[PDB]
A paper describes a structure:
Bacteria usually express two highly conserved type IIA topoisomerases (Top2As), topoisomerase (topo) IV and DNA gyrase, involved respectively in chromosome relaxation/segregation and DNA supercoiling. Topo IV is a tetramer composed of two subunits, ParC and ParE, that form an active E2C2 complex; likewise gyrase through GyrA and GyrB subunits. Topo2As introduce a transient 4 bp staggered break into one DNA duplex and pass a second DNA duplex through the break which is then resealed. In this study, we have co-crystallized the ParE ATPase domain with short DNA duplexes in the presence of adenosine 5'-[β,γ-imido]triphosphate Adenylyl-imidodiphosphate (AMP-PNP), a non-hydrolysable ATP analogue that induces dimerization of ATPase domains to close the ATPase gate.
Comparison of the ParE hole in the 14-mer hole-bound and 6-mer outside-bound structures showed that hole binding by DNA did not significantly alter the dimensions of the cavity and that the side-bound DNAs interact weakly with adjacent dimers in the crystal lattice. By comparison, for the side-bound DNA-ParE44 complex, the B factors on DNA and protein are 69 Å2 and 27 Å2, indicating tighter binding of the side-bound DNA, possibly enhanced by DNA interactions between adjacent dimers in the crystal. However, importantly we note that the side binding of DNA to ParE occurs exclusively through K291, R321, and K346 and K281, i.e., an exact subset of the residues seen in the hole-bound DNA complex and shown by mutagenesis of 291, 321 and 346 to be important for enzyme activity. The biological role of side-bound DNA is not immediately clear. We propose that binding first occurs through the side-bound DNA process and is crucial for initial stabilization of the T segment (reflected in the higher impact of mutation of the protein residues involved). Another new finding is that certain short DNA duplexes, including the hole-binding 14-mer, are sufficient to stimulate the topo IV ATPase activity whereas other duplexes, e.g., 5′-GCGCGC, were inactive.
Author numbering:
A (entry chain B): 5 to 400
B (entry chain A): 4 to 400
The structure:
DNA sequence: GCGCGC
DNA sequence: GCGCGC
DNA sequence: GCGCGC
DNA sequence: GCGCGC
């Protein structure tokens, strides 16, 4: 028996690929509650988005099936349908081998949200079954896996299609012995597809729920500008939609900003179309550029006098809605963790900072009345903050 | 033919070997490749030594920053196994070169441990331009060396003898300067982490020696989270004694110490199997829930909150609060978010902590009524200050 | 100067 | 509240 | 009720 | 401010 007094070579165990995912799902998807369940949806949708980001496919359709499984169909290039160098179908490599993919800089993708080579295989590992259908060159191919990613068929030709059609259809049943819930939630998926649609010009994303026969689709022509208008939808706005974009050594930056009459700071950031809810270097560059340029404008126009302190970043972000979307070349791309909630790529900070600072400095100079109103707004925010502080300290 | 977006076929998919994948995507394993990521490597090697001590093996963990900028961690635990592993190579090589390979999957070699993924040592090796390990066991010292991201350059070889009973593991590594934006280990960063680790290991000495400047420091504490809380309040005026609560629940173990200072900040630290969870999670949620619920219940049943008064906010009771929560979670229930283990996900930790703390704190307040009523009056004043600030803010707008 | 993390 | 690094 | 994550 | 889950 293995115990603390018998700690020898058989006390060390090696978990084969997908078994490690099933044993330690928290390392790969963060949690095994509803947030982790929907993470599986995001891995499959993100792979369809990456095809669209490289130019392939104009529709991504998600279906919640009546049995509770979930399907994602795209019209991208399809997965490669041949034999892989390691002696199994490439499709089976994609779904069964961790750190196996096409987004390590080889050239099959332009900038993509995918980069670790694990998402599809993680979905397969954490599903009681998974099926994939690839359409390419007049044929449809299928492979099925069960019980956490074990192939039960090879990749087989199952039908034909028009010669020019292409795409990938993935259906999976999340493993009810892993997750505390396997109930996919319409609104959770709907909100995420809506966000993704803002970032993919003229791609339609849709959700159909066969459990209740409800469906919704999303399509936007104007990217982050439409997104900012959506954020301020149920609010009174105090400014037009400001739009800033630029490029820098393979990086691309787009940002839309608009003030509402509220006092909340509502900044959403994205890297290669992946939501980074916890921000990171790109959000840091945006926030720094705003504060530095607005303070410089305030001071050089005398709205902040010689004796006044600079305003705080939070003063300028009161009532601000902003959407920041950047594209980062694969060679510079670095996320914190499989969940990709934060961007670590150091170059994104000067990239975003430089582009935003340049465009905003010019915008303030050309729109002086709006600029001074924005500063006066931030000064009133400072006054309210300092009034609250004085009352809090006096109460104490 | 060149791989490009118009030639996306079977050769466009590449499979990365384990350590190669770590080097290619370090953010997936250590979060970042700045100074925080650099020191993460230290925590992986230290955490393994702490896990030995948590199972009862070793009472001293010595960290050395060497003159060449490498880092050594030496423990006196059981040592890594020195034989041949079932997969074909020496066990030591499996530990350092194979991801998801280890002794903390429930097999029984460890009691409750901070390690659980089987990746930490192999990540440090992958991200080092060299690494050496020396194992002391069965009267001998064995050494193996790896270079260039984890490639063995020696076999595991005997390099000396040892007394029959002595055991331990010594790991030295040079972080890869081609990966990290800084490879300058920071004395204060490591010292702070070892200090926190010492509070949670009764009577284990942890030490740091920096050969670059010839400075050293040790940490050794007898009274656990109570010493820890006193440390947090060291440069402040305190308003209460150290309150200590502990309990057990179906293999879970909970300890918490609390003490108010005269400040207005809240300073709550949480740990799971001695791993700092800086972003909290289910155990910290349970603790915060229990405090708010029990303190509002006490305030209301004593009439300090009248019929028409709203309950106080959790932030009113945490003003000036210092608190150290340490829980032990059995392997079969243990689940962290991510390799950096900044947040506990284990669902059962919430009811476990909430139940133990609520029970103990309810009884404590009933038995210490004058102190309880003073703490409620303090939180009511915090409510008043928060309401005064909100009023003034709204009137300014 | 600035955001960030302690 | 302060040092760190961009 | 409570903390949490929108 | 509000729903979700413990
Ligand atoms: N819908 C798809 N269409 C075409 N190819 C796909 C599709 N989904 C996945 N692939 C291919 O399969 C590879 C592996 O996918 P996956 O395991 O999710 O890793 P990844 O996108 O490369 N990186 P990550 O998601 O960050 O783990 C991808 O890199 C693509 O080459
Ligand atoms: N100092 C040590 N003394 C004894 N055994 C050790 C020591 N360090 C590592 N090991 C063994 O090597 C195994 C693998 O270590 P490691 O790769 O760090 O993964 P881990 O501790 O199991 N889990 P994690 O650290 O969460 O990735 C451990 O589980 C132990 O069995
Ligand atoms: Mg992917
Ligand atoms: Mg997430
Ligand atoms: Mg470990
Ligand atoms: Mg950390
Ligand atoms: Na994969
Ligand atoms: Na390992």
């Amino acid at each position: 028996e293995i115990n603390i007094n018998n700690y020898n070579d058989d006390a060390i165990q090696v978990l084969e690929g997908l078994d490690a995912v099933r044993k330690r799902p928290g390392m790969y998807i963060g949690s095994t509650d509803g947030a982790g369940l929907h993470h599986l949806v995001w891995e499959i949708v993100d792979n369809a988005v990456d095809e669209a980001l490289s130019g392939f496919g104009d529709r991504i359709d998600v279906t919640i099936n009546k049995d509770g499984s979930l399907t994602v169909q795209d019209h991208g290039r399809g997965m490669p349908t041949g034999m892989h160098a390691m002696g199994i179908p490439t499709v089976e490599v994609i779904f069964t081998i961790l750190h196996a993919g096409g987004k390590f800089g080889q050239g099959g993708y332009k900038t993509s949200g995918g980069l670790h080579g694990v998402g599809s295989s993680v979905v397969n590992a954490l599903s009681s079954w998974l099926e994939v259908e690839i359409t390419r060159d007049g044929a449809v191919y299928k492979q099925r896996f069960e019980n956490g990613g074990k192939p039960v068929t090879t990749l087989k030709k199952i039908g034909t299609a028009p010669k020019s059609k292409t795409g990938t259809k993935v259906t999976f049943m999340p493993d009810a012995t892993i997750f505390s819930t396997t109930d996919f939630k319409y609104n959770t998926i709907s909100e995420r597809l809506n966000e993704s649609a803002f970032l993919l010009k003229n791609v339609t994303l849709s959700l159909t729920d066969k459990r209740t026969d409800e469906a919704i689709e999303f399509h936007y022509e104007n990217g982050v500008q439409d997104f900012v208008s959506y954020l301020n939808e149920d609010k009174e706005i105090l400014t037009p939609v400001l739009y800033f974009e630029g490029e820098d050594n393979g990086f691309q930056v787009e940002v839309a900003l608009q003030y509402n009459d509220g006092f909340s700071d509502n900044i959403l950031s994205f890297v290669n179309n992946v939501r980074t809810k916890d921000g990171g270097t790109h959000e840091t560059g945006l926030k720094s550029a705003i504060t530095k340029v607005m303070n410089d404008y305030a001071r050089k126009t005398g709205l902040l006098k010689e004796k006044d302190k600079n305003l705080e970043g939070s003063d300028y972000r009161e009532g601000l809605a902003a959407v920041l979307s950047i594209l980062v070349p694969e060679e510079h791309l670095q996320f914190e963790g499989q969940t990709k909630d934060k961007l670590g790529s150091p170059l994104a900070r000067p990239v975003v900072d430089g582009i935003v600072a340049d465009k905003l400095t010019f915008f303030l100079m050309e729109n002086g009345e709006l600029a001074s109103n924005l500063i006066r707004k931030a000064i009133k925010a400072r006054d309210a903050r300092e009034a609250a502080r004085k009352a809090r300290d006096e109460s104490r």
